[PDB]
């Protein structure tokens, strides 16, 4: 019964394909609802047109800063920040979808898609979904990153929305 969303991603204007994400609203309803609404844009703002600004091969791809486009911003549907809902889901492997933050209870809009098991983040970042399809597109995104996180191409969420 869980929500499903998509990200269509470009590199320097060239489509890479579609990533389809399941949001675990059965475990983290409040965190899933934020992400879903930021994909649809239904509150008047959201991810469409924003970038994957920090991409580190064999680690993760980070995105969601639609206000500042640089890692310093983003906002949630609940305001600038919202609390950590729970830490029930763990960073079990590639494809995990989890919230970026700046310490406890500072969830906004930024998120990451893991390209490995990032279990040292358990208990610190709220996991709220996982990739169902398009992991090959995530691997293309990953290929445009570097150890520093700097990308070699501008990686844009050219479209996003709900599929469920």
């Amino acid at each position: 019964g869980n929500p499903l969303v998509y990200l269509d991603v470009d590199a320097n204007g060239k489509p890479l394909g579609r990533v389809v994400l399941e949001l675990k609203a059965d475990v983290v309803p409040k965190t899933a609802e934020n992400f879903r609404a930021l994909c649809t844009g239904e509150k008047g703002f959201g991810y469409k047109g924003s970038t994957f600004h920090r991409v580190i091969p064999s680690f993760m791809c980070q995105a969601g800063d639609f206000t500042n486009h640089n890692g310093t911003g983003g906002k949630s549907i609940y305001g600038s920040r919202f609390p950590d809902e729970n830490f029930t889901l763990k960073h079990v492997g590639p494809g995990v979808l989890s919230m970026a933050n700046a310490g406890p209870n500072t969830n906004g809009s930024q998120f990451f898609i893991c390209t490995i098991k990032t279990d040292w983040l358990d208990g610190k970042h709220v996991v709220f979904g996982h990739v169902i399809e398009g992991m090959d597109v995530v691997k293309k995104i990953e290929s445009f990153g570097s150890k520093s996180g700097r990308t070699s191409k501008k990686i844009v969420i050219t479209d996003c929305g709900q599929l469920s």
Partner: peptide, 11 residues
Amino acid sequence: XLLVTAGLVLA
């Protein structure tokens, strides 16, 4: 290190 933060990226 390998963290995912929003403002002061740490080691």
